[PDB]
Structure 1
C-alpha cells in the first residue's frame, strides 16, 4: 500500500513485534484526526494501513507506542512514544516506508520514499 511502518530493536538485534502504531491526519481546525492503526508483525512490519485513493495530500502523524514495548521487556524507557510528522505530496515518490530504530533512551527514524 502507499504507507508502511517498520520497527527494529537495537538492544536485542531483532524486529519489534506487537507494538501499537497510530496514524493521524491534520484536520482543518489543526487537531489530529485518527486515521488508521495496527500492531507490528513478527517481522516488525505494519502493512495495509491505507489505500492509494484514501491517502491524499496533507500532513500526517505516525505514533509508535515505544513505552509499552520497553515495559513489556522490563526495561526503563525515556520517551513516552516515538512520533513522526510529515507532509505527504502528490508530485514526488508515493510509496512511504517509515522506519524506526529503538533504544530505551534513544530512537532514530528515517523515511524511504519511492517512485
Structure 2
C-alpha cells in the first residue's frame, strides 16, 4: 500500500478495531478534499486506501474517529478525531505508514516512510 494507517488503543492494550478513518488531501483553494476512507481491521490496520497513481505529492490529513471509541470507558475524549497532517512524496514516491497510539487525552502519530 502506498499509504497504510494503523491504530492502537493505549488504554486497553489492543489494536483499535472497526474504527473509521478519513483521509483528505489539501486542494488548491485550501479546503481539505476527501481522498479515501475505511475502517480498521482486526489488527488495527487499514490497507488498500489508495494507489500510487492517485497518491500524488501533496499535503494529507488522516482523521481517526474517536468520539464513541472511548464510551464504554466512561470518558469523552479531547476531540472527536485524532488527526495528523503529513507532507507526501515531495522528494519522489515513497510508502507511508501512519501509526497512531491513542488515549482519550493523548496520542502519538508517527509517520514511517520507506523507499519502495
Q: TM-score over 0.5 for the alignment?
A: yes
Query: Following TM superposition, by how much is the alpha carbon of 1:105 offset from its aligned partner in structure 2, in angstroms?
Result: 1.4
Instruction: Show structure 2 runs of 5+ residues with no match.
Output: none
Residues 32-41 or 89-98, more deviating:
89-98
Q: Normalising by structure 1, report the TM-score.
A: 0.92
| 1:55 paired to 2:69 | no
Q: Normalising by structure 2, report the TM-score.
A: 0.92
Q: 3-state SS of the aligned residue for 1:43?
A: coil
Q: 3-state SS of the aligned residue for 1:41?
A: coil
| Equivalent residue, structure 1, for 2:42 | 42
Instruction: Show structure 1 runs of 5+ residues with no match.
Output: none
Q: Deviations over 1:28-55 (max 9, x none)?
A: 1101110100000010000000001110
RMSD of aligned residue pairs (Cα, Å): 1.4
| Equivalent residue, structure 2, for 1:68 | 68
8 Å contact 1:100–1:108 — kept in the other structure? yes
